[PDB]
Motif scaffolding. Structure first.
Motif, short mmCIF file in Angstrom:
data_model
loop_
_atom_site.label_atom_id
_atom_site.label_comp_id
_atom_site.label_asym_id
_atom_site.label_seq_id
_atom_site.Cartn_x
_atom_site.Cartn_y
_atom_site.Cartn_z
N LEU A 80 98.59 -10.51 -11.09
CA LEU A 80 98.14 -9.61 -12.14
C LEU A 80 97.62 -10.42 -13.31
CD1 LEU A 80 100.60 -6.62 -12.15
CD2 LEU A 80 98.42 -7.00 -10.94
N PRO A 81 96.46 -10.05 -13.87
CA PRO A 81 95.91 -10.80 -15.01
C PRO A 81 96.44 -10.29 -16.34
CG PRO A 81 94.32 -9.17 -14.27
CD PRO A 81 95.55 -8.98 -13.42
N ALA A 109 105.54 -15.93 -11.91
CA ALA A 109 106.44 -14.96 -12.50
C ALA A 109 107.26 -14.34 -11.39
CB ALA A 109 105.69 -13.87 -13.28
N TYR A 110 108.50 -13.98 -11.69
CA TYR A 110 109.37 -13.37 -10.70
C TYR A 110 109.95 -12.08 -11.26
CZ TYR A 110 108.91 -18.28 -9.57
OH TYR A 110 108.41 -19.53 -9.34
N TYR A 111 110.57 -11.30 -10.39
CA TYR A 111 111.16 -10.03 -10.79
C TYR A 111 112.65 -10.19 -11.04
CZ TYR A 111 106.88 -7.50 -9.41
OH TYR A 111 105.59 -7.05 -9.30
N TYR A 151 110.75 -12.52 -15.10
CA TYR A 151 111.18 -13.75 -15.75
C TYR A 151 110.25 -14.87 -15.30
CZ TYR A 151 113.48 -15.52 -11.49
OH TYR A 151 113.75 -15.98 -10.22
N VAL A 152 109.80 -15.67 -16.26
CA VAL A 152 109.04 -16.85 -15.98
C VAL A 152 109.96 -18.05 -16.10
CG1 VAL A 152 106.81 -15.91 -16.67
CG2 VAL A 152 108.27 -17.01 -18.37
N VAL A 180 97.43 -15.49 -15.56
CA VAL A 180 97.49 -14.70 -14.34
C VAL A 180 98.85 -14.93 -13.71
CG1 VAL A 180 96.48 -14.23 -12.10
CG2 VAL A 180 95.00 -14.81 -14.04
N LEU A 181 99.60 -13.86 -13.51
CA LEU A 181 100.97 -13.98 -13.02
C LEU A 181 100.97 -13.83 -11.51
CD1 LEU A 181 103.14 -12.32 -15.74
CD2 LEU A 181 102.02 -14.57 -15.64
N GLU A 182 101.07 -14.96 -10.81
CA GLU A 182 101.30 -14.92 -9.38
C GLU A 182 102.70 -14.36 -9.14
OE1 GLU A 182 100.49 -18.80 -7.77
OE2 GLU A 182 98.41 -18.78 -8.50
#
Ligand code: K
Ligand code: MG
Ligand code: MG
Ligand code: MG
Ligand code: MG
Ligand code: MG
Ligand code: MG
Ligand code: MG
Ligand code: MG
Ligand code: MG
Ligand code: MG
Ligand code: MG
Ligand code: MG
Ligand code: MG
Ligand code: MG
Ligand code: MG
Ligand code: MG
Ligand code: MG
Ligand code: MG
Ligand code: MG
Ligand code: MG
Ligand code: MG
Ligand code: MG
Ligand code: MG
Ligand code: MG
Ligand code: MG
Ligand code: MG
Ligand code: MG
Ligand code: MG
Ligand code: MG
Ligand code: MG
Ligand code: MG
Ligand code: MG
Ligand code: MG
Ligand code: MG
Ligand code: MG
Ligand code: MG
Ligand code: MG
Ligand code: MG
Ligand code: MG
Ligand code: MG
Ligand code: MG
Ligand code: MG
Ligand code: MG
Ligand code: MG
Ligand code: MG
Ligand code: MG
Ligand code: MG
Ligand code: MG
Ligand code: MG
Ligand code: MG
Ligand code: MG
Ligand code: MG
Ligand code: MG
Ligand code: MG
Ligand code: MG
Ligand code: MG
Ligand code: MG
Ligand code: MG
Ligand code: MG
Ligand code: MG
Ligand code: MG
Ligand code: MG
Ligand code: MG
Ligand code: MG
Ligand code: MG
Ligand code: MG
Ligand code: MG
Ligand code: MG
Ligand code: MG
Ligand code: MG
Ligand code: MG
Ligand code: MG
Ligand code: MG
Ligand code: MG
Ligand code: MG
Ligand code: MG
Ligand code: MG
Ligand code: MG
Ligand code: MG
Ligand code: MG
Ligand code: MG
Ligand code: MG
Ligand code: MG
Ligand code: MG
Ligand code: MG
Ligand code: MG
Ligand code: MG
Ligand code: MG
Ligand code: MG
Ligand code: MG
Ligand code: MG
Ligand code: MG
Ligand code: MG
Ligand code: MG
Ligand code: MG
Ligand code: MG
Ligand code: MG
Ligand code: MG
Ligand code: MG
Ligand code: MG
Ligand code: MG
Ligand code: MG
Ligand code: MG
Ligand code: ZN
Ligand code: ZN
Lengths: 53, 141, 154, 181, 110, 123, 69
Positions: C67-68, C7-9, C38-39, C58-60
Motif C-alpha cells: 500500500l502506498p 510493515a506488519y499487522y 507495526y514497523v 510504500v508498506l510491503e
RNA sequence: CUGACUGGGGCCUGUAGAGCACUGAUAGGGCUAGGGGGCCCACCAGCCUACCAAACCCUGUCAAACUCCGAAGGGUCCCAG
RNA sequence: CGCCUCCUAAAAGGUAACGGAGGCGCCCAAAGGUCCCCUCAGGCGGGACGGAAAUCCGCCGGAGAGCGCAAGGGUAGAAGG
RNA sequence: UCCCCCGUGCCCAUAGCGGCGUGGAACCACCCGUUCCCAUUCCGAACACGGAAGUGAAACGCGCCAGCGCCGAUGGUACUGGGCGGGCGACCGCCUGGGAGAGUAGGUCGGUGCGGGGGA
RNA sequence: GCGGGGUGGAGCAGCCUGGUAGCUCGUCGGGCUCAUAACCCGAAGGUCGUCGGUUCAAAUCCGGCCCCCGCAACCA
C-alpha cells in the motif's frame, strides 16, 4: 440605614395605627410617603401615611 | 532581563515538576537545540547567562531563539526572618522547565559553532542537557 | 521518493511489548480501511529521515499487498526523543493535502499543497535578508493547489 | 396618498432610466427611496438651555413633522456631558412627507446654500445610502432669519434600497441631486 | 441573531408554556387566521380551525371571531374547556382578540 | 439670505446696506441704484420685491461677490506663496507685503505683542 | 400621524425671485424665496456669472512684443 | 437487616492531564490605526523604515485565583450481596 | 478580630496557616409589583459645528455591553433598556 | 402512505456563516391603502386595521457547494483508582483495571413528532 | 519593622470631602531714579515623582515602583 436614609412607620390614616415600618431617603423623598397598604384592624386596604418612628 | 511586563497576580504558588515537557519538545525555528533532561526552575539569570554565552561565541553572528520564558514569580523572604507574616517578596522570575523541552535553538551557524555554543550554554544551567539537531521527526510536528 | 518499508499487522500485542521488541507501533488508515500495524524501528528510521511527510513510503504488508502511504503523524516520546507511534495514510486516487518541500534558486522549508497522488512532486522551486516572499506568487507545477492562505510569508 | 412633483417624477423619469442604466429584471430590484432621517446634533442644548424647543419647532416647520429628542447614551466629562441629557433632535421622514421635503430641499434649500458648488459625490455609503451635513437651517424656505435665534445645521440621511453606491448615485442624480465632481 | 418578532414569540410562549395549560395558539397571516390548541407535553395538536379550512371570507376581524367559535365548538366536543391563549408575536387586539372573544363565546375557558 | 447671500440690514438706506456685502463699497452701491432706478436713499425696509429683484439681479451679475470674491483673493495669495514670490514668503511668515518696516509696529499683520526678555545691564 | 403635535402641511406655492413658481406642500401657504434650482448658476449648467477669466493671467500678460526682433 | 465494604444502574463534579476558545502572559515572523525615527519639509504635502505600536495572519509557548476540553476517581439515590 | 467573593480545596459537601487577592458596615419611592414594547459592546463606511469618544444613517456583530458598588455565578428565549 | 406549503414542537450547530440555484397555482411574505380599531419618546418602519392591483426584488421555504464554522474516529500517549518498586532529592518506573485532551482519517450545507392547506 | 513627604524656579496651600490648581518670594516687560535697590503697574511659568487601577472625570480615591526625610530595633 443612615442619617439621610431614615426608618419610618406607616400609619393607617383611618384607624391611626402604625402597621408597617420601612425606610426612605428623605433627601430624595422629602414628602411624607403615602402608600395604600392592607390594614389588619380596618381589615381593608387604606392609604397609609409616614409618621415619625 | 526577561520577565513578564505585566501580571494579573504578583505571587504564584510553588509548582510541582511532574512529567515530561508539555509542549515545545521539538525543534521548530533553528538548526540545533538544547533540550532539558531533568526538570527545574530556570532563572532569568541562567537563561541570560546561557544567551550571552552563545552570543560571545557566535561573536554577535548567527541567531539565538530562547524558547522558554520566566513568567513564574520567584519569592524569597528577607534574610534571617521567622516563618509566617505572609509570603515573601518577589525576588526574580523562573521558567518551569521539564524534560524534553527545547530551551534554546541556534541557526545561521556552522555545525561546530552550534554544538560548541550550546555546550557552553548547558554549563550555565542547573540541569543536564542534550544537544539535538532538527530532524524530520521535528519537521513532522 | 519513493521508499519501501516493511510493515506488519498486530491485534493484541502491547504497544510497550512491541516497543520493548524494537518495533514501532502504528496504524494504517484511509477512507476505506484502518489497520493496527507495526514497523521495525531501526528500519523505519532511515526510511523516514529521507522520506519525511513529503515523500511516499510504500508498506510491503506481509500478505503481499504494497500500500502506498504518506506519513501523516509521528507521536514522539517527549522524554527520550523517540518515535512512539506512526500514522500511515494510505494513498488512493482521491486528492490529499500534504507538505511539499521548497527549494529556492528562507522562512518556510515546505508548503501545504492540495495534490493528487499521481501528481505528487518532489520539488517546488523559488527564486532570487531581509526581503521575503509569499505563497501566492509561486510556481505550482501541474495538478497542485495552494493549501494555505497565500498571505503566508516565505 | 397624494401626488407631488418629485414622486411622479421618480416613477416617470427616474425608474425607466434606472432600468435602462442597470437592467433590473424585477420591478423591485430597481432602487427606491427608503426614508430621509434628519438629525440635528445639538449638544449646545446639552444643559445651558432648552433651545431644543425652538430647534424642534423649526425642524417641525421645515419638515411638517415633529422631531423626537435623542438623549445621551453614555456620560462624557470632556463634552460636559452626563448620560441621558437631550443632545439632539432626530425626525424620520417617509412616504409623502419624504418626497415633499426632498422636493423643497432640491428646489430651494440647496440653491440657498451660500457658495453652493454641488453635493459631495463621495458621501455615498458603499451601501447605496447618502448623508449630507448642513450648517444653516435658514437654507429652508419655512425658516426666515427673523424667526431664527442661533445658526443650527443638521445631518440628512437619505436611505435607499440600492445595494451599491453607483446604483444610488444614479437614483439620486436622476431625481435632481446636484453633484459637484 | 433574533428579530424582535421571534423574541416576542419566545417571550410570550415560554411564559404561556410554563403554566401547563393547553395552548390555544393563533397564527395570523396577512389574509387568513389560524388556530390550533396544542399539548406541549406531547408536542401534539388536539383541535384546529382556520379561515383557509373553513373557507370563510370577508372581514378579517369578523372572520377571526368565527374561527374562534368554530375552534371552541370542536374543542368542547373533544372534552376541552381550559386553555391558555397564545397570542405569539401579536398584540392582544383586533383579529387575534376577535378570535379570542369568540373562543370564549363558544365556551373555551381562558 | 437675499442679496447676494447676505441679508443687507433693513431700516438703513439702500446705498449703505449694499456696502455690507463683501465686494460692494460705497462706489459700487452708487452704481447699481443709478443703473436700476432705485432711490439710493429709500430704506431697504421700503423696497418693492421688484426693486429687490432688480437690484439683486444687477448686483450678483455685474461683479463677483461674497464667497466667490474671497476665492479669487485666496487663490491669488495662494499663487503668490506657491511660486515662491517674495510676497508669498511674506504671506507665509505672516509679515507685511507692501514695503512697510517691521523693526517697530507691523502690529496689525503680526498681532498681539509676544513680549520677550531683553538684554541686561551690568550692576 | 399623532394628533395635535405636528404642523399641518397644506398646499403651498413657493416663489423664487426669477418669477419662478413651485407648487409643493408646506407649513406655510405661500413662500417667496429669492433663488431656486431653476436659476442657480451651478444649476443652470454653466452660468459663469462674472468669471469667464480663464485666466487670462499670466501668459496673457501680453501687449506687447516691443523688444526688437 | 436497614451496617462497613461490594455488584449493576442513574444522576452530580471541573481536579490530574491537556488546551489557548475567554482573561492574562508570551518567543520569532507577516501585515498594519497614533507617532517616535526622520533626506526633508509647513506654501498645502509628503516620503522611507535590518525599531518600538494595538488589530489580523503564521510559527511556538505559560498560568492557583484562565478553560474550547476533561479523565481516573469521588459523592448520592435505587436494586442486590 | 464580624460579613461577602475568588483561589488555595486534592472534579460531592467541608477543609488550615500572621497563605495569594479583593470588597462590605450601604443603597433604591424606584433601582419595587405587573402588563406592554425594545436589545447591547464594539468594528468598518457615510454625516455641519463634532473631536478617538455627544447625536444621525448603513452594514457586520451570540453577547466580549448592561445588570448601583467587590468578586464569582447567572443572564438578550432578559435578570439588561 | 408520497411530494409541497403553513403552523407548532423535539434534537440542540452534522442544524450555522458564505456562495449559488430555485419557488408565487397555493400558502406565506412583501405589497395596496390609513376610513375605522390600534399605533410612533418623530415615522403606518414597527404595532394595528381594511384590502387584493403587482412581485417573488426583500424576507421565507426548498435545493446544490466543504471556503469558514461545527462535528469527529481508529490507533498511540498523558493522567489515574488499586497493587508494587526506584531515587538524597527534584522526581521516576512496573503490574492490573480505567483512560483523555490535542492532532490524524473522516463527517456535515440537518434530522424528526404533531396538526392544517394543496398535490398525486 | 513602623511613619511622613514628593505639585510653577524656591518654600508652602489645594488631597480629607473627585470636576475649580492657590499664597509669599523669585523670573520677565514697563514705570519712578542721574543710576541701583526699595517701591508702583502688568505678565509668564505647574499637565501635580512614576506606572497601573476605580471613575464620565484623578494633584485629589485605591494599589505597586522610584526617591527623600523621621522613628523603632526591647527581655535575654
Ligand atoms: K528581663
Ligand atoms: Mg425606600
Ligand atoms: Mg389583632
Ligand atoms: Mg415618619
Ligand atoms: Mg509550596
Ligand atoms: Mg502547571
Ligand atoms: Mg502540540
Ligand atoms: Mg533556584
Ligand atoms: Mg520561592
Ligand atoms: Mg524592603
Ligand atoms: Mg509568610
Ligand atoms: Mg517566600
Ligand atoms: Mg518544559
Ligand atoms: Mg549543566
Ligand atoms: Mg549530535
Ligand atoms: Mg533510533
Ligand atoms: Mg530524533
Ligand atoms: Mg496537515
Ligand atoms: Mg421592468
Ligand atoms: Mg401628509
Ligand atoms: Mg465615496
Ligand atoms: Mg429659507
Ligand atoms: Mg440601501
Ligand atoms: Mg382576520
Ligand atoms: Mg363570514
Ligand atoms: Mg402564537
Ligand atoms: Mg462691502
Ligand atoms: Mg521693511
Ligand atoms: Mg522676441
Ligand atoms: Mg440484608
Ligand atoms: Mg450502602
Ligand atoms: Mg488525580
Ligand atoms: Mg495542570
Ligand atoms: Mg490565550
Ligand atoms: Mg496549562
Ligand atoms: Mg486548572
Ligand atoms: Mg470536544
Ligand atoms: Mg474531593
Ligand atoms: Mg465507592
Ligand atoms: Mg461510588
Ligand atoms: Mg454510582
Ligand atoms: Mg441490602
Ligand atoms: Mg469570634
Ligand atoms: Mg458582622
Ligand atoms: Mg470542593
Ligand atoms: Mg470552589
Ligand atoms: Mg451538607
Ligand atoms: Mg488542626
Ligand atoms: Mg409616588
Ligand atoms: Mg436593582
Ligand atoms: Mg430591575
Ligand atoms: Mg414599571
Ligand atoms: Mg464614524
Ligand atoms: Mg464623529
Ligand atoms: Mg457581562
Ligand atoms: Mg467598586
Ligand atoms: Mg389518510
Ligand atoms: Mg417552519
Ligand atoms: Mg426566481
Ligand atoms: Mg434564498
Ligand atoms: Mg402570488
Ligand atoms: Mg404569477
Ligand atoms: Mg384618523
Ligand atoms: Mg429571494
Ligand atoms: Mg436536504
Ligand atoms: Mg472542513
Ligand atoms: Mg466561500
Ligand atoms: Mg464538541
Ligand atoms: Mg479531536
Ligand atoms: Mg483512544
Ligand atoms: Mg507517563
Ligand atoms: Mg496505574
Ligand atoms: Mg479510591
Ligand atoms: Mg499509585
Ligand atoms: Mg526514600
Ligand atoms: Mg538534591
Ligand atoms: Mg508512567
Ligand atoms: Mg507512574
Ligand atoms: Mg490500560
Ligand atoms: Mg494503565
Ligand atoms: Mg479525542
Ligand atoms: Mg492516527
Ligand atoms: Mg477533510
Ligand atoms: Mg456534503
Ligand atoms: Mg453545514
Ligand atoms: Mg418542523
Ligand atoms: Mg415530540
Ligand atoms: Mg404532515
Ligand atoms: Mg388532503
Ligand atoms: Mg396532507
Ligand atoms: Mg519642580
Ligand atoms: Mg517646592
Ligand atoms: Mg500656605
Ligand atoms: Mg487637607
Ligand atoms: Mg475637593
Ligand atoms: Mg498661583
Ligand atoms: Mg523688573
Ligand atoms: Mg553724569
Ligand atoms: Mg529699580
Ligand atoms: Mg489616573
Ligand atoms: Mg483635576
Ligand atoms: Mg485614569
Ligand atoms: Mg502612588
Ligand atoms: Mg521591660
Ligand atoms: Zn386601619
Ligand atoms: Zn429661481
Amino acid at each position: 440605614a443612615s442619617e439621610v436614609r431614615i426608618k419610618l412607620l406607616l400609619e393607617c390614616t383611618e384607624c391611626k395605627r402604625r402597621n408597617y415600618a420601612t425606610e426612605k431617603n428623605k433627601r430624595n423623598t422629602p414628602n411624607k410617603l403615602e402608600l395604600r397598604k392592607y390594614c389588619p384592624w380596618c381589615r381593608k386596604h387604606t392609604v397609609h401615611r409616614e409618621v415619625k418612628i | 532581563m526577561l520577565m513578564p511586563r505585566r501580571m494579573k497576580y504578583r505571587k504564584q504558588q510553588r509548582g510541582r515538576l511532574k512529567g515530561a515537557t508539555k509542549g515545545g519538545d521539538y525543534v521548530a525555528f533553528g538548526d540545533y537545540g538544547l533540550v532539558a533532561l531533568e526538570p527545574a526552575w530556570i532563572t532569568a539569570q541562567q537563561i541570560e547567562a546561557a544567551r550571552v554565552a552563545m552570543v560571545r561565541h557566535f561573536r554577535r553572528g548567527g541567531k539565538i531563539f530562547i524558547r522558554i520564558f520566566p513568567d513564574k514569580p520567584y519569592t524569597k523572604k528577607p534574610l534571617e526572618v521567622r516563618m509566617g507574616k505572609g509570603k515573601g517578596n518577589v525576588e526574580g522570575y523562573v521558567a518551569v522547565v521539564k524534560p524534553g523541552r527545547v530551551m534554546f535553538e541556534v541557526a545561521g551557524v556552522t555545525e561546530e559553532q552550534a554544538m560548541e555554543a550550546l555546550r557552553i550554554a548547558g554549563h550555565k544551567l542547573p540541569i543536564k542537557t542534550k544537544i539535538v539537531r532538527r530532524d524530520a521527526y521535528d519537521e513532522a510536528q | 521518493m519513493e521508499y519501501r518499508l516493511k510493515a506488519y499487522y498486530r491485534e493484541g500485542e502491547k504497544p510497550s511489548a512491541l516497543r520493548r521488541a524494537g518495533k514501532l507501533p502504528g496504524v494504517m488508515y484511509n477512507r476505506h480501511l484502518n489497520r493496527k500495524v507495526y514497523v521495525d524501528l531501526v528500519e523505519f528510521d532511515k526510511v523516514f529521515r529521507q522520506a519525511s511527510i513529503h515523500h511516499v513510503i510504500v508498506l510491503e504488508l506481509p500478505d503481499g499487498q504494497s500500500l502506498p502511504t504518506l506519513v501523516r503523524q509521528v507521536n514522539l516520546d517527549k522524554r527520550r526523543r523517540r518515535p512512539e507511534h506512526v500514522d500511515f495514510f494510505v494513498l488512493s486516487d482521491e486528492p490529499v493535502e500534504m507538505y511539499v518541500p521548497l527549494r529556492f534558486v528562507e522562512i518556510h522549508r515546505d508548503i501545504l499543497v492540495k495534490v493528487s497522488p499521481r501528481n505528487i512532486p518532489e520539488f517546488i522551486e523559488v527564486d532570487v535578508i531581509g526581503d521575503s516572499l509569499h505563497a501566492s506568487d509561486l510556481k505550482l507545477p501541474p495538478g497542485v493547489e495552494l493549501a494555505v492562505s497565500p498571505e503566508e510569508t516565505i | 396618498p397624494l401626488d407631488v412633483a418629485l414622486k411622479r417624477k421618480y416613477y416617470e423619469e427616474v425608474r425607466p432610466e434606472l432600468i435602462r442604466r442597470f437592467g433590473y429584471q424585477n420591478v423591485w430590484e430597481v432602487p427606491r427611496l427608503e426614508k430621509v432621517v434628519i438629525n440635528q446634533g445639538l449638544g449646545e442644548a446639552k444643559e445651558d438651555a432648552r433651545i431644543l424647543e425652538k430647534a424642534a419647532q423649526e425642524l417641525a416647520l421645515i419638515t411638517g413633522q415633529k422631531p423626537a429628542v435623542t438623549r445621551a447614551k453614555k456620560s462624557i466629562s470632556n463634552f460636559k456631558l452626563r448620560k441621558g441629557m437631550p443632545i439632539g433632535l432626530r425626525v424620520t421622514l417617509r412616504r409623502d412627507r419624504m418626497w415633499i421635503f426632498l422636493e423643497k430641499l432640491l428646489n430651494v434649500a440647496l440653491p440657498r446654500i451660500r457658495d453652493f458648488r454641488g453635493l459631495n459625490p463621495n458621501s455615498f455609503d458603499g451601501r447605496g445610502n447618502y448623508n449630507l451635513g448642513l450648517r444653516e437651517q435658514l437654507i429652508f424656505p419655512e425658516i426666515t432669519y427673523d424667526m431664527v435665534d442661533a445658526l443650527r445645521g443638521m445631518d440628512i440621511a437619505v436611505v435607499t434600497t440600492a445595494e451599491t453606491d453607483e446604483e444610488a448615485r444614479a437614483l439620486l442624480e436622476l431625481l435632481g441631486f446636484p453633484f459637484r465632481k | 441573531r433574533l428579530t424582535a418578532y421571534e423574541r416576542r414569540k419566545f417571550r410570550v410562549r415560554n411564559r404561556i408554556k410554563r403554566t401547563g395549560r393547553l395552548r390555544l395558539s393563533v397564527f395570523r397571516s396577512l389574509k387568513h387566521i389560524y388556530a390550533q390548541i396544542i399539548d406541549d407535553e406531547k408536542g401534539v395538536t388536539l383541535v384546529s380551525a382556520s379561515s383557509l379550512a373553513l373557507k370563510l371570507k370577508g372581514n378579517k376581524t369578523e372572520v377571526a371571531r368565527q374561527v374562534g367559535r368554530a375552534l371552541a365548538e370542536k374543542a368542547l366536543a373533544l372534552g376541552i374547556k381550559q386553555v391558555a391563549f397564545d397570542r405569539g408575536p401579536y398584540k392582544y387586539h383586533g383579529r387575534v382578540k376577535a378570535l379570542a372573544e369568540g373562543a370564549r363565546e363558544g365556551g373555551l375557558e381562558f | 439670505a437675499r442679496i447676494a447671500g447676505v441679508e443687507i440690514p433693513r431700516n438703513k438706506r439702500v446705498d449703505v446696506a449694499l456696502t455690507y456685502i463683501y465686494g460692494i463699497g460705497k462706489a459700487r452701491a452708487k452704481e447699481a441704484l443709478e443703473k436700476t432706478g432705485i432711490n439710493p436713499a429709500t430704506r431697504v425696509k421700503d423696497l418693492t420685491e421688484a426693486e429687490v429683484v432688480r437690484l439683486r439681479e444687477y448686483v450678483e451679475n455685474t461683479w463677483k461677490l461674497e464667497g466667490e470674491l474671497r476665492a479669487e483673493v485666496a487663490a491669488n495669495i495662494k499663487r503668490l506663496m506657491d511660486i515662491g514670490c517674495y510676497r508669498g514668503l511674506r504671506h507665509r511668515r505672516g509679515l507685511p507685503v507692501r514695503g512697510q518696516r517691521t523693526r517697530t509696529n507691523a502690529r496689525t499683520r503680526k498681532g498681539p505683542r509676544k513680549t520677550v526678555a531683553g538684554k541686561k545691564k551690568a550692576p | 400621524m399623532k394628533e395635535g403635535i405636528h404642523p399641518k402641511l397644506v398646499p403651498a406655492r413657493i416663489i423664487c425671485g426669477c418669477g419662478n413658481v413651485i407648487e409643493t406642500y408646506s407649513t406655510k401657504p405661500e413662500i417667496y424665496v429669492e433663488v431656486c434650482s431653476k436659476c442657480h448658476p451651478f444649476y443652470t449648467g454653466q452660468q459663469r456669472f462674472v468669471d469667464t477669466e480663464g485666466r487670462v493671467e499670466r501668459f496673457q500678460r501680453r501687449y506687447g512684443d516691443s523688444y526688437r526682433k
